[PDB]
Structure 1
């Protein structure tokens, strides 16, 4: 619902989107909340929040460290949902997406997980280790709870995959680092967003010109966090700068 309103509004303004990503509870519950508020203040159109998983076999060292930090803070999925409720209570319209690992969703029942997401105000869920081939129970539970199932369109994707992603996904299509936007639109795929390697304003511009509805910046934001670790008050302003210095590239 929120993604739809967003793209609709971003279309009446001839602009794209800039979605940043960060790990919840990193480097702490308090600092994390302050980090996200800063991100939205700068210009974050939507958010992609990761829940700390013990064995993130699909994330680079950058994100691995973040999880470690969260765990070092005693951060748990439960506290993450406590945070999401707080974020939602302060920002009612910004789309919030979660980056999950299958086991954290499957653990207490798939249906129950998506129910909690709807309850707290989450808008979409991308399960990193669930390809469309195994997505059935996940996307079905998501749809039943008004949650958008996000699917990744890899660089080595084929026509068959394009059609599935187009019909199974909602909210937006996660694109991994021109014609690939043609098919999706032809198949009526959720507004496509380019990700991976998106760390510069020009990359965002070329993405919109390519036909994308916007661009997601992966570790681009996380890379900034860690580099200002010992300096909290510096990290925030450091982030404000980049975000604003990126959303502008979508107008």
Structure 2
């Protein structure tokens, strides 16, 4: 499909940035995660980034390490996560859905098979946290064969060789961590840039778009709301809705 391309064209027609929250699938449980994700969409999320719990998430900070542990406490498996993804896509046909994966979960039972499963449940992109562009060929190839966009991190100090690789290899969007990088990425016809570091307040959403990025990704701020409201599931959803509405409003 072309869900990212459709979303960005529609957002451009409204002179609008995208707001993309990150949550861990199954945190703090399967049913509550499904409600959390529906609330994020209903509150105005333009796209989702969704992590599959992994034992050794060596690219995530403590807030997300704890989300993984909560999901594991509930017995959440990658198999169950794919069941969730199919339910989510069935409720929401057009929202782009990206996964944040660790390499072993992609490689485990076959790279091609993983991306085929992604295609079958309606996923749009996969960012493999511990696969640098230098190692990415079998991953991005399998992604593209199954109509999945491979997403790559563009680090703040990326040199020109890295910028060219990320521009050539990525699709869907460029995960972006003096707006020099944004201009070079556009110069190299990269996928539209989403700013992903330090997005916790509406002011940061507006500032990322003003710099020339197509939108902003916020995960820790969303996950911290889940963490803070564990004992009150209903207040959790209400606080999620309040926060995403404010963040999305800042992209208009």
TM over 0.5: yes
Check conservation: 1:177, 1:194, Cα contact below 8 A. no
In the TM superposition, what is the alpha-carbon distance from 1:177 to its structure 2 partner? 13
TM-score w.r.t. length of structure 2? 0.98
In the TM superposition, what is the alpha-carbon distance from 1:201 to its structure 2 partner? 1.2
Check conservation: 2:98, 2:124, Cα contact below 8 A. yes
Check conservation: 1:46, 1:94, Cα contact below 8 A. yes
Check conservation: 1:194, 1:214, Cα contact below 8 A. yes
Check conservation: 2:156, 2:181, Cα contact below 8 A. no
Pick which of 152-161 and 2-11 moved more. Answer: 152-161
SS of match in other structure, 1:174: strand
User: Structure 2 unaligned runs (5+)?
Assistant: none
C-alpha distance 77-40 of structure 1, shift in aligned 2 (>3 A): same
Q: Give deviations 1:200-239, integer Å, cap 9, x for gaps.
A: 1111111111111011112111111101111100110101
Check conservation: 2:98, 2:123, Cα contact below 8 A. yes
Structure 2 CA distance for aligned equivalents of residues 87 and 121 of structure 1:
9
Q: Give deviations 1:108-128, integer Å, cap 9, x for gaps.
A: 000000000000000000000
Q: Which residue of 2 aligns with 1:168?
A: 169
Structure 1 CA distance for aligned equivalents of residues 172 and 71 of structure 2:
28
Check conservation: 2:24, 2:52, Cα contact below 8 A. yes
In the TM superposition, what is the alpha-carbon distance from 1:34 to its structure 2 partner? 0.3
Structure 2 CA distance for aligned equivalents of residues 243 and 177 of structure 1:
28
Q: Which residue of 1 aligns with 2:49?
A: 48
Check conservation: 1:155, 1:177, Cα contact below 8 A. no
Aligned residues: 251
Structure 2 CA distance for aligned equivalents of residues 190 and 80 of structure 1:
27
TM-score w.r.t. length of structure 1? 0.99
RMSD of aligned residue pairs (Cα, Å): 1.0
C-alpha distance 177-25 of structure 1, shift in aligned 2 (>3 A): farther
